[PDB]
Amino acid sequence: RCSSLIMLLSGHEGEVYCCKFHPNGSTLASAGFDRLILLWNVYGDCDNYATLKGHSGAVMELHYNTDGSMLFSASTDKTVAVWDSETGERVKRLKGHTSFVNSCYPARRGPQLVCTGSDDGTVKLWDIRKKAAIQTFQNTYQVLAVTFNDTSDQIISGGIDNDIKVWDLRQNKLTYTMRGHADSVTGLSLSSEGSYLLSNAMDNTVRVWDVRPFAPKERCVKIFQGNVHNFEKNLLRCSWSPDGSKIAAGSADRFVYVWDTTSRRILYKLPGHAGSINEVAFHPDEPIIISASSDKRLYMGEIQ
């Protein structure tokens, strides 16, 4: 067993584009095509204790700060909503993007900054007390996944420009371009220790880069196969294990993929889903995996 809780989560009315664990590990957030975030309990009978309405379009990216009280939600319409998790009312809207917002990310260490990316190309940063766009990094093409580093002083935007592009918050320029992908980069996730960063793209390959000031001049250290991207062209997301040992990239062939970081082999190829798997997440404390896919269902499960 090695946990406290394969039990299924049904109740999503359409696709689930993003699933995230609360960092305390007792509650759960999942959202997608429903314009409707569902808050589950991780243990117990896995009920749906709270619901978040306030998106006029589908929810592209759910995200939790390490505080875990406020939930960040990049939606399809033009907006990124900021919610609270206990009583569940949207404390803020963030309305500066002119197209479909594909991504958001919490700044967890310092001030609460929400770096977002959208289909216009603008990568916009969002302090919640400003109610405005702080800095807009103008990428010429669409960005599908954005994330901070551990320092929250750089933004790491992956998009359809075949390159992962990092922007410095003080230099306000693109510093270097992680080239080596052959299609649109859909999912970026960064470790709890913050040195390494996962990359999913429609070249049906997964990369690990090392976003760190110590530069090895070719940051593509680890290349993973097995993944596939299909005609549906979703935003196939990613996650890291909290011990940093396992990566998980969502795939288009209904199989929950979990690799080993060191071994570079597929540890887990899990069945059960029926559609393209958008986001697959990791529990903070115990080795539990939820997986979100287009089959309107979630699969919790003890990996170890």
Partner: peptide
């Protein structure tokens, strides 16, 4: 990649998300 195969690649994706996440779908 190229430039025209990164502008047509954006045109095919703008005309993908503009209709897939259209507010009538």
């Amino acid at each position: 990649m190229s430039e025209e195969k990164l502008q047509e690649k954006a045109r095919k994706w703008q005309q993908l998300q503009a209709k897939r996440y259209a507010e009538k779908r």
